[PDB]
Amino acid sequence: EQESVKEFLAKAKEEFLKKWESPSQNTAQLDHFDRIKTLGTGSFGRVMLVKHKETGNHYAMKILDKQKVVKLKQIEHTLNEKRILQAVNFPFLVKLEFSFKDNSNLYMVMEYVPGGEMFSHLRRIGRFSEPHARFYAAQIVLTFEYLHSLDLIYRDLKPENLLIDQQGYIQVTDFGFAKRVKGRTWTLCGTPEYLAPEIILSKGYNKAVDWWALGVLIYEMAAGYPPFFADQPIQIYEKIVSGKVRFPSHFSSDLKDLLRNLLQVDLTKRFGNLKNGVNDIKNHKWFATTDWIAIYQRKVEAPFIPKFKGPGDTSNFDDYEEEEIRVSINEKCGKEFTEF
Ligand SMILES: [NH3+]C[C@H](O)c1ccc(O)c(O)c1
């Protein structure tokens, strides 16, 4: 590790810790924004495109229903998400610009990235070439190097959680499962196709699960489909734990070798979790053409630039039923979300 990387990560940790210890709170309110379009929706929350009425800036506003968060046992996860997001700073992480709460909801107002989810682009083109997949993978490697050095585990890597920005670079979203962890953690969370074996088997697990997920992501980017798939989760899990993966013949030998080391069932042998840490990945032959510093500095020409007309264009996102943002006249779940 060049002292330059050590000193970068030491300063990164100092800056993170200062914000972690003293989190920002209550930095805007709902009526500062106009609602434009629902960009995504789930069992306890939504992401909305909004426009700030005074500056005209567009943002992606994540709205979480406090009662549903409680019911689906997401309290600590939502507190993790906001506390981490307000404390991190890296070129490939979506920035949290404001947060606040009201009687009914929690709000995280993030940068809006108009290029859409990697998932859409991957499905439209079919599969990415190895250089294209490598460009995105390198950004994830650097982002995980950053996060893991802060004792953070991300726990939701997948194409739907990676947005393509105006320059063609990655912006990681969706910190709902991210957690500050020294050692092990135990919660069953993630997305089935991306779960490491040790999550499936209810073990105490660590940052190695993020490196496993990177193997899944790289396979999916280069093949067009993930390595372990089936009609039901239990059948996916049987495949994940088996230690067997098949590679398309069009994969390069270097790609197959990297993937066997990321998709290593034995977490004590998995790249990213050995004595040399991230450098086993950064020094692998599949990354020989990668200029890590140039990627970090965003000096590499991207494989493609999403097509969009301006900062408010939603054409790269899909259409959802537009529901109200209702705020109760009575405070709900105040105690549970005191720190938010
Ligand atoms: N999974 C992506 C998520 O819905 C989303 C969409 C647009 C954004 O700018 C964002 O920060 C998050």
Curated annotation (Swiss-Prot):
It is a lipid-anchor. The modification Phosphothreonine is found at residues 38, 185, 187. The modification Phosphoserine is found at residues 129, 328. One of its GO terms (cellular component) is postsynapse. The gene is PRKACA. Autophosphorylated. Phosphorylation is enhanced by vitamin K(2). Phosphorylated on threonine and serine residues. Phosphorylation on Thr-187 is required for full activity. Phosphorylated at Tyr-320 by activated receptor tyrosine kinases EGFR and PDGFR; this increases catalytic efficiency. It catalyses: L-seryl-[protein] + ATP = O-phospho-L-seryl-[protein] + ADP + H(+); L-threonyl-[protein] + ATP = O-phospho-L-threonyl-[protein] + ADP + H(+). Phosphorylates a large number of substrates in the cytoplasm and the nucleus. Phosphorylates CDC25B, ABL1, NFKB1, CLDN3, PSMC5/RPT6, PJA2, RYR2, RORA, SOX9 and VASP. Regulates the abundance of compartmentalized pools of its regulatory subunits through phosphorylation of PJA2 which binds and ubiquitinates these subunits, leading to their subsequent proteolysis. RORA is activated by phosphorylation. Required for glucose-mediated adipogenic differentiation increase and osteogenic differentiation inhibition from osteoblasts. Involved in chondrogenesis by mediating phosphorylation of SOX9. Its main location: cytoplasm. Its EC number is 2.7.11.11. This is cAMP-dependent protein kinase catalytic subunit alpha. The active site is at residue 156. GO terms for molecular function: ATP binding; cAMP-dependent protein kinase activity; magnesium ion binding; manganese ion binding; protein domain specific binding; protein kinase A regulatory subunit binding; protein kinase binding; protein serine kinase activity. It comes from Cricetulus griseus. The keyword Kinase applies. Belongs to the protein kinase superfamily. AGC Ser/Thr protein kinase family. cAMP subfamily.
